[PDB]
Amino acid sequence: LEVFNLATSQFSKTLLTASSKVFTQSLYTADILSIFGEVFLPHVMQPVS
């Protein structure tokens, strides 16, 4: 949802709502957000499977 917000809105921040750095090497850091916004943008726009 926050990746979608980054895709559809100009950056603020208030948009960083779910990501955290508490857990090391998890799937919830900012790097994973970058991965999602880079190589999975259409699925972010239209989530299907």
What residues make contact with a second copy under the rule CB under 8 A?
A: 2-3, 5-20, 22-46, 48
DSSP secondary structure code for residue 4 in this structure: H
Please report how close the Cβ of residue 7 comes to a second copy at its closest, in angstroms: 5
- Nearest distance in Å: CB 8, a second copy: 6
Supply the minimum distance, in Å, between the C-beta of residue 12 and a second copy.
Answer: 4
Distance (Å, rounded) from C-alpha 41 to C-alpha 25?
22
Supply 44's token pair: 């972010």
